[PDB]
Design an enzyme around this catalytic site. Structure first.
Site, PDB file in Angstrom:
ATOM      1  N   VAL A   1       0.816  -1.219   0.000  1.00 26.31           N
ATOM      2  CA  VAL A   1       0.000   0.000   0.000  1.00 26.31           C
ATOM      3  C   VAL A   1       0.868   1.295   0.000  1.00 26.31           C
ATOM      4  O   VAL A   1       0.396   2.367  -0.433  1.00 26.31           O
ATOM      5  CB  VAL A   1      -1.140  -0.058   1.104  1.00 26.31           C
ATOM      6  N   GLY A   2       2.137   1.195   0.435  1.00 29.12           N
ATOM      7  CA  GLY A   2       3.115   2.311   0.288  1.00 29.12           C
ATOM      8  C   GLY A   2       3.882   2.726   1.540  1.00 29.12           C
ATOM      9  O   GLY A   2       5.087   2.460   1.671  1.00 29.12           O
TER      10      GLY A   2
ATOM     11  N   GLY B   1       9.403   2.055   8.452  1.00 26.40           N
ATOM     12  CA  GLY B   1       8.919   0.857   7.746  1.00 26.40           C
ATOM     13  C   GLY B   1       7.927   1.045   6.604  1.00 26.40           C
ATOM     14  O   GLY B   1       7.737   2.163   6.147  1.00 26.40           O
ATOM     15  N   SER B   2       7.285  -0.053   6.167  1.00 26.53           N
ATOM     16  CA  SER B   2       6.332  -0.091   5.010  1.00 26.53           C
ATOM     17  C   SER B   2       5.133  -1.078   5.138  1.00 26.53           C
ATOM     18  O   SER B   2       5.216  -2.088   5.836  1.00 26.53           O
ATOM     19  CB  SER B   2       7.072  -0.475   3.734  1.00 26.53           C
ATOM     20  N   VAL B   3       4.069  -0.806   4.372  1.00 26.40           N
ATOM     21  CA  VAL B   3       2.713  -1.316   4.641  1.00 26.40           C
ATOM     22  C   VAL B   3       2.080  -2.185   3.558  1.00 26.40           C
ATOM     23  O   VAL B   3       2.125  -1.837   2.361  1.00 26.40           O
ATOM     24  CB  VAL B   3       1.719  -0.152   4.866  1.00 26.40           C
TER      25      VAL B   3
ATOM     26  N   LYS C   1       2.202  -3.484   8.999  1.00 25.78           N
ATOM     27  CA  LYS C   1       3.428  -2.681   8.784  1.00 25.78           C
ATOM     28  C   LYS C   1       4.597  -3.437   9.364  1.00 25.78           C
ATOM     29  O   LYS C   1       4.572  -3.889  10.550  1.00 25.78           O
ATOM     30  CB  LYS C   1       3.320  -1.346   9.491  1.00 25.78           C
TER      31      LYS C   1
ATOM     32  N   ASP D   1      -0.020   8.666  13.167  1.00 31.83           N
ATOM     33  CA  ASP D   1       1.239   9.313  12.771  1.00 31.83           C
ATOM     34  C   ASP D   1       1.899   8.493  11.680  1.00 31.83           C
ATOM     35  O   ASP D   1       1.907   7.292  11.764  1.00 31.83           O
ATOM     36  CB  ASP D   1       2.179   9.425  13.964  1.00 31.83           C
TER      37      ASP D   1
HETATM   38  C1  LIG Z   1       3.803   7.382  16.652  1.00 32.61           C
HETATM   39  N1  LIG Z   1       2.321   7.305  16.712  1.00 32.61           N
HETATM   40  N2  LIG Z   1       1.711   8.282  17.484  1.00 32.61           N
HETATM   41  C2  LIG Z   1       0.404   8.041  17.369  1.00 32.61           C
HETATM   42  C3  LIG Z   1      -0.602   8.898  18.139  1.00 32.61           C
HETATM   43  C4  LIG Z   1       0.054  10.256  18.407  1.00 32.61           C
HETATM   44  C5  LIG Z   1      -1.937   9.190  17.478  1.00 32.61           C
HETATM   45  C6  LIG Z   1      -0.953   8.168  19.428  1.00 32.61           C
HETATM   46  C7  LIG Z   1       0.137   6.935  16.584  1.00 32.61           C
HETATM   47  C8  LIG Z   1       1.389   6.529  16.159  1.00 32.61           C
HETATM   48  N3  LIG Z   1       1.867   5.538  15.359  1.00 32.61           N
HETATM   49  C9  LIG Z   1       1.265   5.108  14.246  1.00 32.61           C
HETATM   50  O1  LIG Z   1       0.303   5.710  13.757  1.00 32.61           O
HETATM   51  N4  LIG Z   1       1.797   3.985  13.735  1.00 32.61           N
HETATM   52  C10 LIG Z   1       1.299   3.342  12.675  1.00 32.61           C
HETATM   53  C11 LIG Z   1       1.370   1.927  12.618  1.00 32.61           C
HETATM   54  C12 LIG Z   1       0.852   1.227  11.518  1.00 32.61           C
HETATM   55  C13 LIG Z   1       0.290   2.002  10.499  1.00 32.61           C
HETATM   56 CL1  LIG Z   1      -0.373   1.226   9.018  1.00 32.61          CL
HETATM   57  C14 LIG Z   1       0.245   3.398  10.555  1.00 32.61           C
HETATM   58  C15 LIG Z   1       0.734   4.076  11.644  1.00 32.61           C
END
Ligand SMILES: Cn1nc(C(C)(C)C)cc1NC(=O)Nc1ccc(Cl)cc1
EC number: 2.7.11.24
Length: 330
Positions: free
Chosen positions: A26-27, A28-30, A45, A160
């Protein structure tokens, strides 16, 4: 204990349990993938080199600690987490499984005519999610539409993943003290862009950003210049053509006057005056959606780790513990 299967995906190798089928990038990596234990479709991921350096390893551990603690619906949650490794010694790879969400607020806002009702429901869900995060003493610091997963029910989650556009002025005069309401600034920036179709503050850089922000809210008067320590900063701000605060109703003239007012309460230069998530969830604008009995706060988050300087193997190992003690959700 699970049984695995390996796979060659976009250069990157991938080994995940067989509960997970039809992995596709879908586009570490996912990867988008199929959760056979649940019928539901999930995001997987693979962290890129989770423990390559101290900064990497501490990031990876912060990542696992944040996802593990997040249990609210307007905030990314962790379904599963795994490694192919059987030993601490083997331990090199970390995978995160989360709800597949697909589209972000960008993928919406630039190709759906938005009502004022959508705006209300999208901001309301940001704010309720922000409430929960802020209650755990986490500041997001990077709210922007690519950090908001939106589905076809227009249902929203924070995560994030051009930053400067959504950044508070004070995080561009690298102040480091920030209250939580750097996030309410970004939220204001986002709401406006929904109402409007356009980036509120498309700075060409961090110097433009401030020019652009000051043009709308006006230069800070006396009460605000008081709290500015740095000789640099004050010298810069006091060195401008002193500026009027513009009239929001004019700037956002067609918008719903309740949304306008809320922007006023949100895009306040002095971050002691910025409304909070908990207070915004009560603003008239969200009377359609508000519900003081459905606006949970978070369990206390232990984040003293943040100020440890540790070696790769301690972070690593702490990360391993964390993977181990994982219990799925309900
Ligand atoms: C570093 N981080 N901080 C937050 C908040 C601030 C919303 C709690 C969430 C995250 N981390 C992520 O959003 N991590 C993450 C893991 C897998 C996928 Cl597919 C996308 C993102």
């Amino acid at each position: 204990r699970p049984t695995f299967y390996r796979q060659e995906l976009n250069k990157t190798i991938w080994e995940v349990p067989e509960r997970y089928q039809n992995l596709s990038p879908v586009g570490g990596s996912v990867c988008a993938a199929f959760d056979t234990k649940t019928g539901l479709r999930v995001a997987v991921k693979k962290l890129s080199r989770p423990f390559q350096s101290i900064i990497h390893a501490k990031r990876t551990y912060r990542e696992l600690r944040l996802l593990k603690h997040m249990k609210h619906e307007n905030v990314i949650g962790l379904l599963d987490v795994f490694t192919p490794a059987r030993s601490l010694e083997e331990f090199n790879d970390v995978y995160l499984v989360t709800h597949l969400m697909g589209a972000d607020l960008n993928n919406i806002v630039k190709c759906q005519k938005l009502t004022d009702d959508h705006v209300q429901f999208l901001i309301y869900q940001i704010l309720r999610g922000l409430k929960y995060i802020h209650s755990a003493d986490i500041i997001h610091r990077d709210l922007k539409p690519s950090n908001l997963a939106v589905n076809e029910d227009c249902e929203l989650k924070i995560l994030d993943g051009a930053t400067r556009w959504y950044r508070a002025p004070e995080i561009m005069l690298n102040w480091m003290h920030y209250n939580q309401t750097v996030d309410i600034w970004s939220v204001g920036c986002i709401m406006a862009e929904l109402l409007t179709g356009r980036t509120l503050f498309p700075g060409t850089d961090h110097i433009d950003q401030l020019k652009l922000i000051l043009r709308l809210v006006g230069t800070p008067g006396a009460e605000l210049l008081k709290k500015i320590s740095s000789e640099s900063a004050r010298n810069y701000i006091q060195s401008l053509t002193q500026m009027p605060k513009m009239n929001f109703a004019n700037v956002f003239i067609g918008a719903n006057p309740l949304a306008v007012d809320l922007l006023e309460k949100m895009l306040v230069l002095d971050s002691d005056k910025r409304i909070t998530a908990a207070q915004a969830l009560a603003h008239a604008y969200f009377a359609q959606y508000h519900d003081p009995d459905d606006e949970p706060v978070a369990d206390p988050y232990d984040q003293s780790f943040e100020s440890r300087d540790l070696l790769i193997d301690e972070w690593k190992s702490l990360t391993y513990d964390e993977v181990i003690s994982f219990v799925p959700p309900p």
